């Protein structure tokens, strides 16, 4: 249920495996989140996992963790990006074991951007599970139940507000999972790949079932998946920015 | 309902349809986006909308969205301001028309900052419609019914408390509308227009229907204007740095 | 009920009186935050708080705030650390008394943490008070009560659980009280000095009695110390990083 970091760059296409939360780490203690990247990079560079001419690239990620997200996101191809954000996971060596339970500093951006917007159909229906749970941390363990139908009756005439609620969704998975996540997700979602986009997210899920709020918002991809507004779905254009170059 | 930015350019005094989401811009498609601030300042000054004396404070625009508003409410004169957000709305296009519907990237510093702090009247009232809108995105329908008069009542011999209030109400309109509808908005407050004031808000009421906590707060606004704490109303002093140079 | 800046210079190690929010400071008039640290540096200078070798120090503090407090908390010393606090205090004055009410600029960090995150007690009991105070804004004044015991007895048999939660109350006061309200809570959690820490924080619920958020997660994290689970409390490690050096 991981890759690992060589076998990746083996690969010639990204897939679910080759994307930050699935990648095989190890310990993790406190050490290594104070080791420089020309440490990591040296390191990488010593097992024979990258060259001297892939050292720089290292070495520029800047200090701080959303600067080190957009130079990564900045990348055009697969395996750069993925380098990047192994080493950056090097560093920061829970970025992603934190997405286990109900907090942490790496879910502060994405739990900060689903819970301050608002989904149009939840505006009409605030009592529906899924919103009680964004909204309040209330009913999540029920949060995939569409009570009376009313959010699927809500979406039947309504494309726009399907493609709005839905983007909200992924745009907060986005926030979650930047980088190779995001490029996966973005390659799918330009060829219309629905049933993959719901296998990897299903993935997610299973990967971090302590996690309320995310298996939420999951099980709400899914749901608007099986809708017919998902036919015609327009997904928002930042995200044909994160394909990686043919 | 929108100022040209020639037009604005040749008036003299800050008004409200020479404030940012009132600025009429154009398309706003993924190129534009792209461009960075030299190409902006060469199409301003191809138009003759600027002379190359002005093109170097709009090629200084850092490249974050955070530093240029920073940038932009620095400036202590209008016709400056005015062009440096004309500048940056024609690179991020869609800045304010991120505000017609319930997300956005423009809209999460405001809409957390709402939220994340309270009012004092809702603390003690949480049934009211006003605060479950809110705080659970809950009766926004219905957020300006003062049930049984509490809210108005509540503040009746508590001009601390109406002053807390009203303040963060507006400090959350400040994080929406940085630069030139800030200015604007700071000038009114200065002289006490209260009038005027609720005329712009109610302007941008009527710009973005489609926004229901946006909706709530502008209505709030006015239903504070109406009550006897009005007229001993002290706002924060912040406000007096957003005025321009006499 | 509070501490002078040069008597806690002359003081030997940190106490309560000697951190940030407890410090005595003045006024606090609009012309004291535009003033740059060169200024603020020669005041402290011209005082004989500091000497001309301090002086650097005090300059290199970066101009955002986000920068300023991560230089506090990288000193290691802490009459260094509390010098760096003082000079950023004397030029946002209102920076802890901002902390009084329900909002303010210095207060969004730690609010938005608490309330993006969950609790996994509030998960399953979101009935209870606390919970509907941290997630609503309801029923703060009712928030140390545990309805049915529910939360003691959730606790009971989930020392993992319990470490969670206990850490996220925590993590929040972290972020409210960077610098040395952090060193000195980081100092007695090393040492399991469980009931100077709620001396410390009951110290701090009883300067900022109108800031009901506050309250509740200090109530909260007072309740937490009183059950079993408390012998065996793990804390989160980035605390080790905020001790001072031997
Ligand atoms: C990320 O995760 C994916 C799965 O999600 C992994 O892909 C699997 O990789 C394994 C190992 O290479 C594959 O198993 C091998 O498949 C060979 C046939 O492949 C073709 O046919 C299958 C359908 O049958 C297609 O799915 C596939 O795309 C090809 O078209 C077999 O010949 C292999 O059998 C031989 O080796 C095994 C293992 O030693 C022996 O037990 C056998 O007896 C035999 O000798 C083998 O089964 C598997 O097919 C892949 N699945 C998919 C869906 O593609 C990635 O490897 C993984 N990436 C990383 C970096 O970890
Ligand atoms: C931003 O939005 C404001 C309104 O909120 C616009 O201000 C209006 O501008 C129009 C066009 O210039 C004004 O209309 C003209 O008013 C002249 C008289 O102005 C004085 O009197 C009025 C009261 O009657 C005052 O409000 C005003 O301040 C002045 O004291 C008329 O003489 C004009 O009539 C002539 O031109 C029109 C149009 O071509 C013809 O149809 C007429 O027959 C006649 O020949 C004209 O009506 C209007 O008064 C302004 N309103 C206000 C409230 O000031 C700004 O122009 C706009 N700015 C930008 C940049 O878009
Ligand atoms: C931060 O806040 C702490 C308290 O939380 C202050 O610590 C107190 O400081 C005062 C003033 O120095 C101390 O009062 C003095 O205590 C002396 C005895 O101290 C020993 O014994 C006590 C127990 O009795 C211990 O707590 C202490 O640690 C020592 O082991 C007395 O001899 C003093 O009395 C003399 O002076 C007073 C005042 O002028 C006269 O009225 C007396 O008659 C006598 O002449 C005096 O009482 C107090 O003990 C300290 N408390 C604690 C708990 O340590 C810090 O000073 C403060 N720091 C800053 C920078 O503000």
Known sequence: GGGDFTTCLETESINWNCTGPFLNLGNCQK?????????????????????????????????????????????????????????????????????????????????????????????????????????????????????????????????????KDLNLALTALHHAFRGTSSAYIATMLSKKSNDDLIAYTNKIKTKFPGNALLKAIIDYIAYMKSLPGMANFKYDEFWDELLYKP
Not at 75 to 102: G, P, R
Not at 110 to 125: G, Q
């Open 31 to 163: 050490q290594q989140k104070k080791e420089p990247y020309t440490n990591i990079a040296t390191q990488l560079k010593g097992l024979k996992a990258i060259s001297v001419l892939d050292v720089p690239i290292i070495t520029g990620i800047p200090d701080d963790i959303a600067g080190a997200l957009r130079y990564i996101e900045e990348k055009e191809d697969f395996h750069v990006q993925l380098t990047i954000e192994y080493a950056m996971l090097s560093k920061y060596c829970d970025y992603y074991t934190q997405f286990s339970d109900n907090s942490g500093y790496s879910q502060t951006t994405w739990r900060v951007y689903l819970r301050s917007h608002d989904f149009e159909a939840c505006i009409l229906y605030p009592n529906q599970h899924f919103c009680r749970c964004v909204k309040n941390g209330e009913k999540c363990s029920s949060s995939n139940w569409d009570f009376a139908n009313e959010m699927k009756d809500y979406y039947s005439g309504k494309q726009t507000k399907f493609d």
